[PDB]
Curated annotation (Swiss-Prot), chain A:
Top-level taxon of origin: Eukaryota
Family affiliation: Belongs to the glycosyl hydrolase 84 family.
Native source organism of the sequence: Homo sapiens (Human)
Residue span(s) of domain GH84: 2-275
Entire-sequence positions represented here: 60 to 693 of 916
Protein name per the record: Protein O-GlcNAcase
Effect of mutating residue 11 to K/Q: Strongly reduces affinity for glycopeptide substrates. Nearly abolishes enzyme activity
Curated annotation (Swiss-Prot), chain B:
Coiled-coil regions listed: none
Expressed in which tissues: Ubiquitous. Shows highest expression in the brain, placenta and pancreas.
Outcome, altering residue 197 to G/T: Nearly abolishes enzyme activity
Self-association state and partner proteins as the record states: Monomer. Interacts with CLOCK. (Microbial infection) Interacts with human T-cell leukemia virus 1/HTLV-1 protein Tax; this interaction increases Tax interacting partner CREB1 O-GlcNAcylation.
Protein name: Protein O-GlcNAcase
Catalytic machinery residues: 117 (proton donor)
Residues where a protein binds: 9, 40, 116-117, 161, 227, 255
PTM annotation, UniProt: Proteolytically cleaved by caspase-3 during apoptosis. The fragments interact with each other; cleavage does not decrease enzyme activity.
UniProt similarity note: Belongs to the glycosyl hydrolase 84 family.
Effect seen on changing residue 117 to A: Nearly abolishes enzyme activity
Domain named GH84: residues: 2-275
Taxonomic superkingdom: Eukaryota
């Protein structure tokens, strides 16, 4: 079968169990089938990967694995040992089996070893036994694979997991060639595309990588991931991957926004795409999303998705406001002048729709959804309001010489903190 | 007695019940005495203030007020009806009493009516009855006060709640004079200082406002609030308020970061101030904070310097800590003098080793046992780490923000306070 669902694989606060049960429910309702457990900062998954689960942790984990079974969602337990594992020490290897055996006894049948986001060097001891980094990982991955009875689904995440991370390139990487040559045929290989966050995933790039890993890979997709930028959130549709990829791929697991409720559209459009027009998929997702709010209108949600769209694209309504603002600023010296004021008034009315969107979200019944998104919505509301004020100030300069900011300011007029001060020097 | 503690009075996701019980414990350990319940987006507190609590909610609220009693913390229930209340409609007024009675029967003896962050205009119906906005609030506040037997603590928050919000000024505000003249003497008045986020709260400004409201005010302090800017966090010490304020004030309730665990320093130093040097207070607070950054128990870490650095990168609304200002000055100097000789490269190396200390803080925080603490602060720390690593690479080279950011960089006031 083709694996399609969600990987919880992002940095930061992981989802809690009640949220994960809700995700299985949603995956089944939308006819997806797979969940990959890999939250980088759930401490026993990576930083303290050798440590057994406590009695209470084990009870939560089995209750969670049962919910996946109950909802016919395949539960894939990952582990990330690569920060400090000594690959050539056999108790290290046994500690890894012991760890996986424990989760086996919770009911888990599908597993993954992750070697992403780690140094490319080995310790001294390991360099004598293995001839390269690729040798050390597939050695232990094969040994683990077979040790657990050669299971239904086993995933392997390479260190060179996207186009740009391949040295020197994809076709000639001695790491990936070793992976394809020596990783056992029943083990799957994870791939994020040409980039960590791929704008597109062309099929020629998937033929290229497939040839050297001797397998169609499973896509770990970071199109909707937002752990790398506090200010960002991605409510746009799944986009940039042709449906012609489906037969050339072993699966697609989306790594979405850290805020659980913000991923309704991210997962809905992946579902629709698994059976394609991005705009039409978005309309279906936003329409269905609307009534989990009740007040908020569809037009409000259209605007909200367009302000928080995709990593390389704003939505149409967001791009327009930005163009109008750039045109207004550039042409502001003239304050024909009747066109400037006509488009300034229209621009201010669009800012009002961002204000009113925020107001109605703030009154909605689903407080869970509101809390996941509150900071993002207040962020864009307050910047739009200062932008509206700036346009009004530009229009008033034919009858005033006052500075835009007069006098002493509250701290929010100057945005970003110390991080912001560093960025502006770049 | 003089009230000193915390108001949970910020916008966005409010604290949950297990977090608030933990807050009472800390307030008691540090000899503070008061908690004011006022989360702006707890829907039954403001947006849907008329609605009664369900039985599941009533059981959580009753369990929570019991903890406040158990921990000798006075529990003050606030409610914010001012967005859409019709003051002259007695059905509105009965619903307000019916709401407070319900919470009274949960064990609550102290209450507050908040009229902050609302329009200054009234509906047509109410302009018939009341001669001004201030009259309508004082009328219903007085009515609520007496209806519940004139309780020990009752607080009233004006709409003109800070110097700059007073029209035209503090001493001549028609709104505040009606409040001082007509609000019953046993009701307390909330005030945030000259500004919403006051850098200082001078003594003369408290004299000025006290004269016109006829009573010493309770300071609602937003020095550590961080709901107004996604990117900001304030781990610095309580600062800018002389202890000479204490005899002139009815109390001090601090409105701190939304991130529960980030307010150790904010509340620890308020406690220290209540019994003063901001830097000595910070050292005591960070020292004690260090002992809840454990290492997980292993069966098969954060230093004090790490925490000093973290607080100095996320310090106070109007000043960065010393170590952050230092790195920021050095970086500007390196960029400015980059047109180039051994001085440059000598200070560039020292700058990237300071960058290394940011990374090393983040790495050790990541390994700490208290995952609650890490999660509350992760995106702030993730952010500064990855930007410093890009700054470090940029310094070597010489040898984002979303749609909001794109709009921000087009404004001329971008970086204007740098
Ligand atoms: C399958 C490749 N492994 C990867 N580990 C990181 C993830 O944990 C992040 O969530 C993602 C986006 O910020 O960037 C990479 S991708
Ligand atoms: C007692 C004055 N009322 C106020 N309501 C707002 C608070 O809810 C915010 O959290 C604070 C920081 O943004 O600024 C004002 S202060």
């Amino acid at each position: 079968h083709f694996l399609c669902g969600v990987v919880e694989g992002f940095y930061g606060r992981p989802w809690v169990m009640e949220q994960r049960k809700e995700l299985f429910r949603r995956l089944q309702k939308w006819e997806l089938n797979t969940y990959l457990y890999a939250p980088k900062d759930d401490y026993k998954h990576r930083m303290f990967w050798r440590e057994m689960y406590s009695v209470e942790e084990a009870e939560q984990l089995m209750t969670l694995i049962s919910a996946a079974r109950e909802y016919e969602i395949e539960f894939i337990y990952a582990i990330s040992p690569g920060l400090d594992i000594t690959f050539s020490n056999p108790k290290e290897v046994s500690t890894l089996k012991r760890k996986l055996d424990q989760v086996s006894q919770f009911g888990c049948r599908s597993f993954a070893l992750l070697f992403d986001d780690i140094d490319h060097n080995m310790c001294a001891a390991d360099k004598e036994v293995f001839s390269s980094f690729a040798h050390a990982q597939v050695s232990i991955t094969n040994e683990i694979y077979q040790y657990l009875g050669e299971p239904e689904t086993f995933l392997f995440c390479p260190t060179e997991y996207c186009g740009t991370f391949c040295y020197p390139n994809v076709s000639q990487s001695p790491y990936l060639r070793t992976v394809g040559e020596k990783l056992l045929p029943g083990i799957e290989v994870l791939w994020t595309g040409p980039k960590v966050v791929s704008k597109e995933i062309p099929v020629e790039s998937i033929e290229e990588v497939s040839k050297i890993i001797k397998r169609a890979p499973v896509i770990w997709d970071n199109i909707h991931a937002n752990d790398y930028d506090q200010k960002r959130l991605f409510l746009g549709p799944y986009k940039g991957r042709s449906t012609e990829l489906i037969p050339r791929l072993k699966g697609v697991l989306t790594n979405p926004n850290c805020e659980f409720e913000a991923n309704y559209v991210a997962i809905h459009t992946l579902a629709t795409w698994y059976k394609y027009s991005p705009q039409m998929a978005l309309k279906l997702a936003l329409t269905e999303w609307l009534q989990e709010f009740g007040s908020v209108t569809l037009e409000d949600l259209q605007l909200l998705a367009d302000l928080f769209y995709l990593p390389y694209e704003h939505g149409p309504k967001g791009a327009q406001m930005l163009r109008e603002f750039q045109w207004l600023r550039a042409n502001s010296s003239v304050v024909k002048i009747e066109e400037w004021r006509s488009r300034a008034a229209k621009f201010e009315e669009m800012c009002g729709l961002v204000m009113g969107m925020f107001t109605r979200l703030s009154n909605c019944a689903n407080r869970t959804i509101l809390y996941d998104m509150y900071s993002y919505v207040w962020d864009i509301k307050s910047i739009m309001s200062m932008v509206k004020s700036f346009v009004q100030w530009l229009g008033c300069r034919s009858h005033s010489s006052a500075q835009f900011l007069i006098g002493d300011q509250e701290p929010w007029a100057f945005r970003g903190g110390l991080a912001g001060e560093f960025q502006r020097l770049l």
